[PDB]
């Protein structure tokens, strides 16, 4: 299912600060940036990497929660739905 995506304004800076660059990326590229972004900003339970702490950062606002599990792609997809600008309908 992994399709191509396009990081908007507030979405580009996210991947950029994570070592990304450009205006085109797939689900695999984005997913890889997400993790790196969180680790770069330090928004997770060092004791449990599987437990992310969105707190109130960019990701926190986009999702609208407090924390989300990494090993559980539940809220991640729900947010990406309208967050990850995908193409091909």
């Amino acid at each position: 299912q992994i399709n191509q995506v396009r990081p908007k304004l507030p979405l580009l800076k996210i991947l950029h600060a994570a070592g990304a660059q450009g205006e085109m990326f797939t689900v695999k590229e984005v997913m890889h940036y997400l993790g790196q972004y969180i680790m770069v900003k330090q928004l997770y339970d060092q004791q449990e990497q599987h437990m992310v702490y969105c707190g109130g950062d960019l990701l926190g606002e986009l999702l609208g929660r407090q924390s989300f599990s990494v090993k559980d792609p539940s809220p991640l997809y729900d947010m990406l739905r309208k967050n990850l600008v995908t193409l091909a309908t």
Binding site: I2, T26, V27, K28, M39, K71
Partner: peptide, 15 residues
């Protein structure tokens, strides 16, 4: 040798 987020993160089925 390195795992960290990569260990679990990877799990996330992009598909």
């Amino acid at each position: 040798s390195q795992e960290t987020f990569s260990d679990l993160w990877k799990l996330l089925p992009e598909n």
